Design an enzyme around this catalytic site. Structure first.
Site, PDB file in Angstrom:
ATOM      1  N   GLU A  71      -9.884   8.248  -7.130  1.00 25.62           N
ATOM      2  CA  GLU A  71      -9.698   8.707  -8.496  1.00 25.62           C
ATOM      3  C   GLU A  71     -10.689   8.003  -9.424  1.00 25.62           C
ATOM      4  O   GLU A  71     -11.131   6.888  -9.132  1.00 25.62           O
ATOM      5  CB  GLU A  71      -8.282   8.421  -8.985  1.00 25.62           C
ATOM      6  CG  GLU A  71      -7.181   9.103  -8.212  1.00 25.62           C
ATOM      7  CD  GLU A  71      -5.808   8.773  -8.755  1.00 25.62           C
ATOM      8  OE1 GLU A  71      -5.660   8.706  -9.993  1.00 25.62           O
ATOM      9  OE2 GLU A  71      -4.877   8.577  -7.945  1.00 25.62           O
ATOM     10  N   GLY A 144      -2.709   8.517   0.309  1.00 29.02           N
ATOM     11  CA  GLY A 144      -3.790   9.010   1.143  1.00 29.02           C
ATOM     12  C   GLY A 144      -4.966   8.054   1.172  1.00 29.02           C
ATOM     13  O   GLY A 144      -5.496   7.731   2.236  1.00 29.02           O
ATOM     14  N   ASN A 206       9.084  -2.540  -2.729  1.00 34.35           N
ATOM     15  CA  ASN A 206       9.356  -2.421  -4.156  1.00 34.35           C
ATOM     16  C   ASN A 206      10.829  -2.656  -4.465  1.00 34.35           C
ATOM     17  O   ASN A 206      11.163  -3.269  -5.486  1.00 34.35           O
ATOM     18  CB  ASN A 206       8.923  -1.046  -4.660  1.00 34.35           C
ATOM     19  CG  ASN A 206       7.434  -0.961  -4.929  1.00 34.35           C
ATOM     20  OD1 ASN A 206       6.732  -1.968  -4.962  1.00 34.35           O
ATOM     21  ND2 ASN A 206       6.948   0.252  -5.128  1.00 34.35           N
ATOM     22  N   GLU A 254      -6.280 -22.418  10.496  1.00 33.98           N
ATOM     23  CA  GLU A 254      -5.134 -23.170  10.989  1.00 33.98           C
ATOM     24  C   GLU A 254      -3.822 -22.604  10.468  1.00 33.98           C
ATOM     25  O   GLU A 254      -2.771 -22.849  11.068  1.00 33.98           O
ATOM     26  CB  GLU A 254      -5.262 -24.647  10.609  1.00 33.98           C
ATOM     27  CG  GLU A 254      -6.383 -25.381  11.341  1.00 33.98           C
ATOM     28  CD  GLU A 254      -5.963 -25.892  12.713  1.00 33.98           C
ATOM     29  OE1 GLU A 254      -6.023 -27.118  12.941  1.00 33.98           O
ATOM     30  OE2 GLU A 254      -5.577 -25.067  13.567  1.00 33.98           O
TER      31      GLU A 254
END
Ligand SMILES: CC(=O)O[C@H]1C(=O)[C@@]2(C)[C@H]([C@H](OC(=O)c3ccccc3)[C@]3(O)C[C@H](OC(=O)[C@H](O)[C@@H](NC(=O)c4ccccc4)c4ccccc4)C(C)=C1C3(C)C)[C@]1(OC(C)=O)CO[C@@H]1C[C@@H]2O
Ligand SMILES: Nc1nc2c(ncn2[C@@H]2O[C@H](COP(=O)(O)OP(=O)(O)OP(=O)(O)O)[C@@H](O)[C@H]2O)c(=O)[nH]1
Ligand SMILES: Nc1nc2c(ncn2[C@@H]2O[C@H](COP(=O)(O)OP(=O)(O)O)[C@@H](O)[C@H]2O)c(=O)[nH]1
Ligand SMILES: [Mg+2]
Ligand SMILES: [Mg+2]
Lengths: 440, 175, 432
Positions: A71, A144, A206, A254
């Site tokens: 976008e 996507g 979420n 590490e």
């Protein structure tokens, strides 16, 4: 020198990057325009550390970031915002439409073209780099772009660089809430990428962060800004060891060594202990023991996954601030005493400890209270398998009738790739089931 | 059926051989990594055959009319091994879309005929998505109803093509 | 950066397009002459979606007007926003179809289609990256149905990849205005089911019900109905023009809504619609918008959603708000109304949030459902179609212009197959 390259893909990646770079600029005293007053004030020292920022001749500091999205809207918001002068103009925007929640569009037909430009920019950043530690890739399943382009980019990076570490901070679909109908297809098609090429992937949800905000922070109507700030705090706690001094410092190599018992089980859970509002910051000591115990609370996990249904394979603690190893040892001892927390019988060591002197900062306009001590936990556990199972069922419910499949097939993908990815995910799930069985 | 299709008449084998050669030359063919002369289009060869009997006392004129339909389908593709770009990728996507529709109608037909045969005999209702693609639309009468139909599946022997060969076998079993 | 080419056909399409261009020119601060007089800098950032830029720092909408009656063009020109359109896009002829689909599609439209396509090509070649088209027309009429279907077919032949939207006003259940609405509606739907990606069904009776019961207007005219449809049209493509916390392109809606290719008939809706009288009573919050959007009274298609199930729905909100509340409300709507959502599409509610709300509203939302109840509409038309085709009620007018019974029969068959396809998901309990 010790530094790593941050890559952001998609809307979620770009917004998390906004939060992260706000936090970094606040930490190192760099103004939004890139200048650092401390350089002219002191005339010495090291404040604008090379781990994230590069200093040009004129005293300007430019971040080691690569923003990517199909976008134009999301990145154009950044290019005309408060941080418009901070970033290099190279922002890698595809001047077209977006992947449309289609893995095929983000991987086959449109995910190409700009991939070469993205790789060229990453190569240019790497050539300026000495002692590169690794990559931090931010993206999100269910989109996507965040799935397909992440697949393309991770494949190309593994082909090119190979031995460099590639960490992942991705947003898994929540069990109940989501903003897409075709989310499970993308999340199930991204598993080959997340398994084969990545070195260690941190997953967040979420819904869990919404519950954390509602309960701990007393925010009734949180939005994505708070989520991005929390994730930024987690990433900063992870990467603080490369920048500031500390008693027990843990770099990325590490760090990986003590959290991946086998190559295919590199899926730890991440938590941040002292999430608390300013009002509740008082009335509480917030000692080392309190935060270490709170790290284990099932309610405070950032993925909807109960640890009590599985066994802890490994744990890494990263403390910040006025912390002394005696209290950390006491907390580890009293936690090992408890029987509710179950550890696999083949890992008697259990815990890795790292301590850093720099306390966490407070973002202006933020919600977290200023505290003297903090701890970020990473924990490899088997219970994450459950978080996958709830997804797989949903995928079956959509793949039995071949719903929405034609959108994927009409952009290059074959029907069989769905079943291949599902079989791979089932293999991973059974591997996690196998690793936790008690030895005899 | 198809409108304004140039249906011609042949009286000897040489004419139909000429038609066959012209049709094969006219077909759209492109080279690809999986085949030097892969097919880019489905093809249907149709013979309308009429038997007439001439006798005013016993026979019937135009007594029989029948159709031979011979269908060559373009196979599935994977862009990774195929190596297609641009127009080739679009052709592959369209081929895969049509083949997915064909698989769906095959499976739905199989389930529908098996159930009402075995289950009780209800015949309540079973929609079949014939209209989702032109290929399944033109071959509606051949995949079911008024036709006697044969399916010839081709299989590759190599181990690398195992996942596609198994799918072909599964769909043959369903058919 | 994306464009949308706009096409208008027939009287209804022309008037709806005129009102739509007035609503869009307000949102962007374009003055009835083409000059910009806005205040917010974000208005001009993505103005390329609808408007081309002229040499005098003016803005010209990327619109195409089509009809076979000059009266509609004359009415459009002699209006508040008539001069904004460029005159070269006014394509028309004479001797209109007269509510004859055959004249619109085969006899008369076949001559004007070349000119319309020439203007379409001229507008399309100038875009940086064309996204798709959208067409406003009425199915129950003459030139509207025929020329809209013909243009849709030609454009899909020429531009297969691009998106094709359509805001169609379908015949009403009991309200009628022409005798031969079923024939035109059946043929137009036969054309649309093949050659479109989305189709927003609009019904006059639903809009009248909204005007009377919800907005409490005593004497509604066509202007109000155009207003509603125009607010819906802007609300659909909001995310192309303004920033948001979670964007939603047209392709995102197309992917997330339709499960199968032949089911792309959407019932639209808008909120908040009050009464100019009770504005001071109803508090504006996300729960209120969610309550109003899913109300059966608020749909614009005159088909009760409670008689079917929602295959997919999409909610596009505009205004500052919290994502937590929005997601919780969508989950709540799914959980309580568990019987009206299919069981094999888990979490079938697309969500989008845009930051910039409409002009003088704090928050707004638009709803796009895809329910099996739409089948009822088709059934009604099909019923009426039979009631005339069995006796050949008016068939000589259509066969005189170069058609035959086979076209009618195949259109009816396509309608019935579409209705059966929607029916086959309508019932619960997929086992037996
Ligand atoms: C108290 C106040 O401010 O007045 C409101 C008002 O009372 C209400 C009733 C308005 C009013 O709308 C109507 O009365 C109406 C009547 C018939 C058909 C359509 C609308 C309003 O006219 C409509 C007008 O809305 C807008 O201006 C929006 O930006 C709208 N655009 C236009 O209406 C418009 C029309 C012509 C030219 C330019 C703009 C819009 C909405 C969505 C997307 C794009 C644009 C507003 C806020 C109001 C009034 C003035 C009373 C309502 O309309 C909208 C869409 O806002 C009707 O339900 C809403 C709720 C509002 O509270
Ligand atoms: N926590 C968090 N989640 C986000 C944020 N932005 C988006 N998401 C989630 O990401 C999911 C998919 O959005 P994205 O992955 O960003 O989609 P995209 O990257 O823009 O890719 P496209 O779909 O092609 O546009 C949504 O369902 C959101 O729930 C964010 O800022 N924070
Ligand atoms: N929603 C709406 N419908 C209209 C309007 N004007 C006419 N109609 C409808 O259009 C139908 C008549 O079709 P018509 O517009 O004459 O088709 P055309 O001659 O091809 O343009 C009637 O059923 C009306 O309900 C309008 O302004 N708004
Ligand atoms: Mg996006
Ligand atoms: Mg062949």
């Amino acid at each position: 020198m010790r530094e790593c390259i941050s890559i952001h893909v998609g809307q979620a990646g770009v917004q998390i990057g906004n939060a992260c770079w706000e936090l970094y600029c606040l930490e190192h005293g760099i103004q939004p325009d890139g200048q650092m007053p401390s350089d002219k004030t002191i005339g010495g020292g090291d404040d604008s550390f090379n781990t994230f920022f590069s200093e040009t001749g004129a005293g300007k500091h430019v971040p080691r970031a690569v923003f990517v999205d199909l976008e134009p809207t999301v990145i154009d918001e950044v290019r005309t915002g408060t941080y418009r002068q901070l970033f290099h103009p190279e922002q890698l925007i595809t001047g077209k439409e977006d992947a449309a929640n289609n893995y095929a569009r983000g991987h086959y037909t449109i995910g190409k073209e700009i991939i070469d430009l993205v790789l060229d920019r990453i190569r240019k950043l790497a050539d300026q780099c000495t002692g590169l530690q690794g990559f931090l890739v931010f993206h999100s399943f269910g989109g996507g772009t965040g799935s397909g382009f992440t697949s393309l980019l991770m494949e190309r990076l593994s082909v090119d660089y190979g031995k460099k570490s590639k960490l992942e901070f991705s947003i898994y679909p929540a069990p109940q809430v989501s903003t897409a109908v075709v989310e499970p297809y993308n999340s199930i098609l991204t598993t080959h990428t997340t398994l084969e090429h990545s070195d260690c992937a941190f997953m967040v949800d979420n819904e869990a962060i919404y519950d954390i905000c509602r309960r701990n922070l007393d925010i009734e109507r949180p939005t994505y800004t708070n989520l991005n700030r929390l994730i930024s705090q987690i990433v900063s706690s992870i990467t603080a060891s490369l920048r500031f001094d500390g008693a027990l410092n843990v770099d990325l190599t590490e760090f990986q060594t003590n959290l991946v018992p086998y190559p295919r089980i590199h899926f730890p859970l991440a938590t941040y202990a002292p999430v608390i509002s300013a009002e509740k910051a008082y009335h509480e000591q917030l000692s080392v023991a309190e935060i270490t115990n709170a790290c284990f609370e099932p309610a405070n996990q950032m993925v909807k996954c109960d640890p009590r249904h599985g066994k802890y394979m490994a744990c890494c603690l990263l403390y910040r601030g006025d912390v002394v190893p005696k209290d950390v040892n006491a907390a580890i001892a009293t936690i090992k005493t408890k029987r509710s927390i179950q550890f696999v019988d083949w890992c008697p060591t259990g815990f890795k400890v790292g301590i850093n002197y720099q306390p966490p900062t407070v973002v202006p306009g933020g919600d977290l209270a200023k505290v003297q001590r903090a701890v970020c936990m990473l924990s490899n556990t088997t219970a994450i398998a459950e978080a996958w199972a709830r997804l797989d069922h949903k995928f079956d419910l959509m793949y039995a009738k071949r719903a929405f499949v034609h959108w994927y097939v009409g952009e290059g993908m074959e029907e069989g790739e769905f079943s291949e990815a599902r079989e791979d995910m089932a293999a991973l799930e059974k591997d996690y089931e196998e690793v936790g069985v008690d030895s005899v | 059926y198809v409108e304004d299709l140039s249906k011609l008449a042949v009286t000897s084998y040489n004419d139909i051989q000429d038609l066959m050669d012209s049709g094969n030359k006219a077909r759209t063919v492109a080279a690809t990594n999986m085949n030097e002369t892969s097919s880019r289009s489905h093809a249907v060869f149709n013979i309308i055959f009429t038997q007439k009997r001439h006798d005013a006392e016993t026979n019937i004129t135009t007594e029989k009319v029948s159709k031979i339909s011979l269908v060559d389908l373009a196979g599935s593709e994977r862009a990774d091994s195929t190596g297609a770009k641009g127009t080739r990728l679009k052709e592959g996507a369209n081929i895969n879309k049509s083949l997915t529709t064909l698989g769906k109608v095959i499976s739905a037909l199989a389930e529908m005929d098996s159930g009402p045969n075995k289950n009780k005999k209800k015949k309540k209702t079973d929609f079949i998505p014939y209209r989702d693609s032109v290929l399944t639309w033109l071959l509606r009468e051949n995949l079911g109803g008024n036709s006697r139909t044969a399916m010839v599946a081709a299989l590759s022997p190599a181990d690398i093509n195992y996942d596609e060969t198994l799918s072909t076998l599964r769909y043959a079993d369903r058919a | 950066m994306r464009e949308i080419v706009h096409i208008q056909a027939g009287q209804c399409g022309n008037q709806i397009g005129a009102k739509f261009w007035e609503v869009i020119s307000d949102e962007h601060g374009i003055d009835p002459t083409g000059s910009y007089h806005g205040d917010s800098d974000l208005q001009l950032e993505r103005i390329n979606v609808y408007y081309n830029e002229a040499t005098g720092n003016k803005y010209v909408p990327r619109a195409i007007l089509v009809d076979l009656e000059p009266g509609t063009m004359d009415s459009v020109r002699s209006g508040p926003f008539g001069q904004i359109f460029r005159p070269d896009n006014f394509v028309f002829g004479q001797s209109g179809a007269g509510n004859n689909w055959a004249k619109g599609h085969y006899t008369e439209g076949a001559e004007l289609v070349d000119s319309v396509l020439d203007v379409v090509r001229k507008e399309s070649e100038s875009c940086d990256c064309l996204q798709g088209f959208q067409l406003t027309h009425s199915l129950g009429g003459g030139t509207g149905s025929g020329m809209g279907t013909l243009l849709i077919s030609k454009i899909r032949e020429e531009y297969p990849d691009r998106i094709m939207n359509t805001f169609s006003v379908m015949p009403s259940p009991k309200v009628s205005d022409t005798v031969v609405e079923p024939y035109n509606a059946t043929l137009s739907v036969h054309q649309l089911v093949e050659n479109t990606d989305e189709t927003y069904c609009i019904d006059n009776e639903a809009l009248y019900d909204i005007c009377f019961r919800t907005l409490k207007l005593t004497t509604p005219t066509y202007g109000d109905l155009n207003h509603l449809v125009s607010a819906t049209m802007s609300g659909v493509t909001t995310c192309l023009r303004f920033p948001g916390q979670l964007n939603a392109d047209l392709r995102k809606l197309a992917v997330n809504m339709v499960p199968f290719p032949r089911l792309h008939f959407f019932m639209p809706g808008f909120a908040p619609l009050t009464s100019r009288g009770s504005q001071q009573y109803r508090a504006l919050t996300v729960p209120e918008l969610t309550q109003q959007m899913f109300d059966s009274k608020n749909m614009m298609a005159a088909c009760d959603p409670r008689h079917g199930r929602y295959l997919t729905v999409a909610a596009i909100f505009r205004g500052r708000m919290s994502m937590k509340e929005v997601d919780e409300q969508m989950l709540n709507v799914q959980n309580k109304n568990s019987s009206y959502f299919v069981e094999w599409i888990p979490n079938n509610v697309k969500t989008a949030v845009c930051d910039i709300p409409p002009r003088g509203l704090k928050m707004s939302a638009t709803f796009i459902g895809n329910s099996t109840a739409i089948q009822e509409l088709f059934k009604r038309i099909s019923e009426q179609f039979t009631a005339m085709f069995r006796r050949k009620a008016f068939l000589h007018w259509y066969t005189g212009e170069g058609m035959d019974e086979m076209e009618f029969t195949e259109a009816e068959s396509n309608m019935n197959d579409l209705v059966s396809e929607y029916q086959q998901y309508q019932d619960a309990t997929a086992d037996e």
